[PDB]
């Protein structure tokens, strides 16, 4: 959830003090920083996947070789969704736009993905979009041939933890009152909570420091590359018979796909 | 060179009991579509088909050439045994699907649901 400083602020001096109404306000000196979300790790242990969608054929029953231009496309709606599951509000916006380079185990591809956290907040944030892929390449087919063009498309999918962390420095100011009247007028730091209080996702890091450390989540699922992948295989009327192959053309790569 | 190749092959039938009870073959190749291989073989017993979710398995393969494998291509025909009559079918055998060592493929069957992923990956024999 979100842990309110503020209320828990009110809590403590309900505690401590007496005080059955509380008023805070955060001191000039209170301040937020070093704000960061780091993944928890950043290879995605899930191998991408291999989706043949539709197959060309084309068939050479000629005696001499063809050239013959094969064109494939496809459109995927693809989503990505983020959110910070702990978090923390304290009087001004905590918020991060954290860019993201995913690797997958095993190989070479690249995804870059970015999302805004906003620590005040559990609400989730996702983006479903399409993308059209088209691709098309020029094949020779030898005589008394035919070629099978098969179109692929490589999918991704990630789930990544991710760490929603900032340090926060500085006192509120708090009035307890008490049977109608103002029984306290104290300041108190986030380290002092922290202290007061080991179950808020705060710690007393000394000097007057509080580190926030907190969580979410960066996911998503999208199309990472287009391959077109072409067999000859001989015509019966072949004879001398040609040979069979299987060789791969790269189609496209997503946007935010590099190697 | 040749090379271990260790290939980690898993089955999907939608249906609620336990795994599925695959029968048939997955065969692969490299480059050429006749130098194909079995990876996984069971024959159709029916009811005594064994219940197999996940499947690996490690073979001695080499190139034309002996030079390292960039890519592998696998197909299959995989069935689900006739509840009735009528098989559920994970994969067909004129589907033809390659990758390269860290990419995944999958062979579609006649659902959604029914279907098979088979991932692969080498070391120096
Ligand atoms: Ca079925
Ligand atoms: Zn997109």
Redesign the interface.
């Known amino acids: 959830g979100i842990i309110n400083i503020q209320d828990e602020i009110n809590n403590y001096m309900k505690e401590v003090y007496g005080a059955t109404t509380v008023k805070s306000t955060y001191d000039p000196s209170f301040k937020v920083f070093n704000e960061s979300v780091t993944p928890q790790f950043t290879e995605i242990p899930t191998?991408?996947?291999?989706?043949?969608l539709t197959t060309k054929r084309v068939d050479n029953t000629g005696s001499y070789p063809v050239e013959s231009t094969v064109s494939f496309t496809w459109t995927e709606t693809h989503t990505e969704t983020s959110a910070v599951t702990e978090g923390v509000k304290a009087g001004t916006s905590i918020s991060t736009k954290q860019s993201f380079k995913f690797g997958?185990?095993?190989?070479?591809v690249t995804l870059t993905v970015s999302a805004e956290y906003n620590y005040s907040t559990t609400n989730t944030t996702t983006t479903t979009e399409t993308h059209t892929w088209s691709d098309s390449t020029k094949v020779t087919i030898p005589p008394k041939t035919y070629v099978?063009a098969?179109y692929?498309i490589?999918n991704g999918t990630y789930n990544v933890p991710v760490n929603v962390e900032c340090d926060m420095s500085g006192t509120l100011f708090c009035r307890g009152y008490r049977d109608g009247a103002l029984i306290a007028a104290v300041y108190v730091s986030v380290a002092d909570l922290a202290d007061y209080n080991p179950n808020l996702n705060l710690t007393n890091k000394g000097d007057g420091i509080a580190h926030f450390k907190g969580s979410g989540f960066i996911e998503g699922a999208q199309g990472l590359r287009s391959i077109i992948?072409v067999?000859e295989?001989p015509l019966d009327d072949n004879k001398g018979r040609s040979?069979?192959?299987?060789?791969?053309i790269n189609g496209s790569l997503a946007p935010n796909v590099t190697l | 060179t040749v090379y271990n190749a260790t290939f980690t092959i898993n089955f999907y039938n939608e249906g609620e009991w336990g795994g599925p009870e695959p029968y048939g073959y997955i065969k692969a190749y490299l480059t050429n579509p006749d130098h194909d291989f079995e990876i996984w073989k069971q024959d159709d017993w029916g009811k005594s088909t064994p219940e197999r979710s996940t499947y690996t398995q490690t073979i001695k393969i080499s190139s034309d050439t002996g030079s390292p494998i960039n890519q592998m291509c696998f197909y299959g025909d995989v069935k689900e045994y006739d509840v009735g009559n009528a098989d559920d079918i994970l994969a067909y055998p004129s589907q033809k699907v390659c990758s390269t060592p860290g990419v995944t493929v999958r062979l579609d069957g006649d659902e959604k649901g029914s279907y098979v992923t088979i991932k692969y990956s080498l070391t120096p024999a």
Not at chain 1, 47 to 52: C, G, L, S
Not at chain 1, 243 to 248: D, Q, V
């Open positions: 191998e991408p996947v291999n989706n043949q997958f185990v095993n190989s070479d099978e098969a692929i490589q992948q067999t295989y040979t069979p192959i299987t060789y791969l």
